[PDB]
């Protein structure tokens, strides 16, 4: 059977709580072996090898776990047939996107999580992990970029996002849809992201021990500009705006950001709106402010890309081209 | 025909562009009489009295337009049979939630906007105004709280949210659905919000010239606690966190807010996630920290209720009671 | 603890497959006791009594089980504090509606299924059933009509429909939304169906042993009139048309029906389209044809309402009014 | 500018109604010339040549218009740069899919319709047509198969379906997402159907004057088997089943289909469930019966593929492999 490596980072899939009929739980109560031994069917589909990379709740995911993860996938790619990275649901969409642009290993790279902790009744973790391996083991998964497999669905790392705070069906690719659906151990892939991923990108965190500082500001009515200023005073390399509607900023936040952009800070306009592209050629003249419109990339994902882009360039027109290709 | 007061605030609906086939536009280029003079069919269903309250794009909505609108409607309630607020789409969902709680008139109060400026080919403002007037003039709409009428659909101001950055069908009550749908100038109503609104709320802004300071901090991987710390230094009365997953906070952010709470800063846990409730009984001990769980209230809606909750109390336990009633 | 009656009809929830990782299966493999006894946590929230009414797959569901369930729930309303009906997922939305119009018991009546067989990994039935009891046991679930509890969501029996062929989250009230969400054994209800249900309807099946014959014919390009002709030829009482777009019929189908209507057959124009209403005032002159527009009711739900109206009247306009209130 | 040929078939796009605020209307009240002239900006992006193929409501679409339509794009492929087919929205997803399997012209073939009649307020027709021409004129649209452009979204003819009976944003590719989004005249493609279309299909209707006889039967509780027998007695070559749940059939329907299959009749199992695949390896042993699982092809789309499969083979297995490829 395929040799599949399971890089365990923690999350709800490893979390347990008081009971099955109680929602309480804490992340990372089990290790990579227990997860695997708990799903002995894995043994009929892949020759599994587990490794605990970290054991955090993804709310605490950070650049170091990211660098570490990419370096690890790239370094052991040549050694295994595919990967499964067990992770919490909270920031999984951010990590999947980050690996999607820094992982040069085009062998199946699947991320999997669980909305219910391992202790719950009808826990989703087992079958999720089982299905995740079904995907990391399918040859047709190679070259699709880094994937997220949840709820019998194979989702591309760039478009996948967490849609609902508790639903087991929460992961969906909200703008462009899923790449495929799994049924009875089989996947019918009918799509692949056209954006450039993995080996077709220039991002190389192999020698990177740290990613550039990129923060996120929220826009809403009567939005304060303290947050944006706080990030600017601390010298952030970039700031992404979780803007209102089609990428718009509260006037005072727009002020701080325009000052920022004109004095060096990379500034990306994204939106707090869940679906749709933050387009240019709407109300904002990005060209005039040196702002970059983020496309279908939501705030946290636009931060992933800006950080990597900032590793190569500081120019708004350059970053924009990157946001237009990746 | 019934008397409907149209309180104009600006927005795309009252905005234009140099082209009908180009996406660029500037808001607030149109006057209420012009918006109203453009939809002469209005005269066949209502005796319309337009008054331009302000002219801004809703990205610039602030507490004063809220105070103004709240009071204006409250004062003029007996002088008219309903209201229609022409508002930008960016923050229409926050303004509707604020009016929903501060307005004491149970006559149909309907908000309306446009995703396409007045100039665009197939501009949606026209029929949206017709339909919003159809709604404010339907006696069945009374007592349903502040409504948002968009795309032939009547939505409650609490649950209604902008779902897509550009789609005309963007406004959706993502958790509980719409109250009704408009076909041929008639509305089939099959739902009404159960959370207490309008006359049933304890919020009286009639004497208020200002609302408490409530900022929103965003959560993502490697999140900077700078924004949160800036909000606490500025003396913010409350901080709504747009957390990850089910209201979870990044380590540093959590720490800053957990401390802010210990010193009286009301802290609400919301979610960057689009649908679902940031529940209590998951991974955060709201009780140990003095945090309130926002429920289905997204960051920006949670901020509306917090400011108002903050007009009534500072006690997290009571604020939490507020977040469960309204 | 509430005394809850579990009337089991069979379906996937009490079905089984040879494997936890194979999608294959057969319905009606488990009895009610085995079923109930497999979620021993049930006895901690309720005093469950189970009764097998039938043990079929809902694909073969039919008039007699509907009448049997209806009589049984009505006869027994007095002995218990609420009901849970385990049912297959295929036609659960039809029975839910049927019982929503014929059950005069206003104590909680909850339907439940499982998309995965009891034998599968991360099988959904157990928590589904647990949550179905948490609902039938909530006093707040009373007077909401018949409900369907699936995926942590309470959905009114009228609007709820099977949205996906295999997704555990398939069940959704597509037009108006869920009534409430279940988190940690508690339900935050924010809605209730506005149409007349249960004790507010004039349908009494208590003395009925059969229900008027109502068939559904599908419309599509190059639609055959043969199926509609067969229904008319067999002397059907009502024919629901699953039309194209806004209730439209293909010419030879529109023909058989305009005539059938002319000769005393009730004809409801519904739609193959999954959401939205088949309205009056589009392209078809219901008046001229004596056609009843189904409203937001999908073909099969329209069948449920037409059979029951057909027990009261044969008059197109009386029927249309029934379609406008139930 | 590109030479785009507009072939008209009628539909709401060319339908007028007595009022711009009355939902009432009739299709086929405008001609291609008028349609084209109505949106004169078309002239700024293409050299439009209108050709009125037919003038009907798509609820009346048939094999003949489909054969003619395929034959016309095929023959005139060399004389133009792209094709935009105006069409009624009712059976649009059907024609879109017919042409997707029979058209060998890989130059942009784009279908467009409108939900609001031309005479209406905020008519969608104008900009839909404009955007459809943008699409047909973008060389990026070549090779994606036949497209459907509605509500600023480029959708593939295979997965596209009418989701709401009245919403202008009703067209969605429910299972795999849209190919791209149009903003300010530019399309951001991020996907293309992986299933085989146009020239990669062995379907050729160039010499065909009639398609095989395939009808659809509906399944619901107590489903009559009359409609299925009607089609059988009439010698239908194929029977698509709009089944309950995962392609399941009401007992008596099952029997008629099973027996008809045994006598050569091709029986394809689809589902009335709007999204998801009708799979094999569930409750029905397709092989044992000579039935074909339709996959994600809804009943009407599966009727398209079956008629075509039926022009090549009559063998269940060959027909099944066709359903796994096209």
Swiss-Prot record, chains A, B, C, D:
It comes from the Bacteria. GO terms for molecular function: asparaginase activity; identical protein binding. It is found in: Periplasm. Residues 2-326 form the Asparaginase/glutaminase domain. Induction: By cAMP and anaerobiosis. One of its GO terms (cellular component) is periplasmic space. One of its GO terms (biological process) is protein homotetramerization. The active site is at 12 (o-isoaspartyl threonine intermediate). Gene3D superfamilies: 3.40.50.40, L-asparaginase, N-terminal domain (3.40.50.1170). The keyword Hydrolase applies. SMART domains: Asparaginase. Pfam families: Asparaginase, Asparaginase_C. Substrate binds at residues 58-59, 89-90. Disulfide bonds join 77-105. Its EC number is 3.5.1.1. E.coli contains two L-asparaginase isoenzymes: L-asparaginase I, a low-affinity enzyme located in the cytoplasm, and L-asparaginase II, a high-affinity secreted enzyme. Belongs to the asparaginase 1 family. This is L-asparaginase 2. It comes from Escherichia coli (strain K12). The lineage of its organism: Bacteria, Pseudomonadati, Pseudomonadota, Gammaproteobacteria, Enterobacterales.
């Amino acid at each position: 059977l395929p040799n599949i490596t399971i890089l365990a980072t923690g999350g709800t899939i490893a979390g347990g709580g008081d009971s099955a009929t109680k929602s309480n739980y804490t992340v990372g109560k089990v290790g990579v072996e227990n997860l695997v031994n708990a799903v002995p069917q894995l043994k009929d589909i892949a020759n599994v090898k587990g490794e605990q990379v970290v054991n955090i709740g993804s709310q605490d995911m950070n650049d170091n776990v990211w660098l570490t993860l990419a370096k690890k996938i790239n370094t052991d790619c040549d050694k295994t047939d595919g990967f499964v990275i067990t992770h919490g649901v909270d920031t999984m969409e951010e990590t999947a996107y980050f690996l999607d642009l820094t992982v040069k290993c085009d062998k199946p790279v699947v991320m999997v999580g669980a909305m219910r902790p391992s202790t719950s009744m009808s826990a989703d973790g087992p079958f999720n992990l089982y299905n995740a391996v079904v995907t990391a083991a399918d040859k047709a998964s190679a070259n699709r970029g880094v994937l997220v497999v949840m709820n019998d669905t194979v989702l591309d790392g760039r478009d996948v996002t967490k849609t609902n705070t508790t639903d087991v069906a929460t992961f969906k690719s909200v703008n462009y849809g899923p790449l495929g659906y799994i049924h009875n151990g089989k996947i019918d892939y009918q799509r692949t992201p056209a954006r450039k991923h993995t080996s077709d990108t220039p991002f190389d965190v192999s020698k990177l021990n740290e990613l550039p500082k990129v923060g996120i500001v929220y826009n809403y009515a009567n939005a304060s500009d303290l947050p944006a200023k706080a990030l600017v005073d601390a010298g952030y390399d970039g700031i992404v705006s979780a803007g209102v509607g089609n990428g718009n900023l509260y006037k005072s936040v727009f002020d701080t950001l325009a000052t920022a952009a004109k004095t060096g800070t990379a500034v990306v306009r994204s939106s707090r709106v869940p679906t749709g592209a933050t387009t240019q050629d709407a109300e904002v003249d990005d060209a005039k402010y040196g702002f970059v419109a983020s496309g279908t990339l939501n705030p946290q994902k636009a931060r992933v890309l800006l950080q990597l882009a900032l590793t190569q360039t500081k120019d708004p027109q350059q970053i924009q081209q990157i946001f237009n290709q990746y």
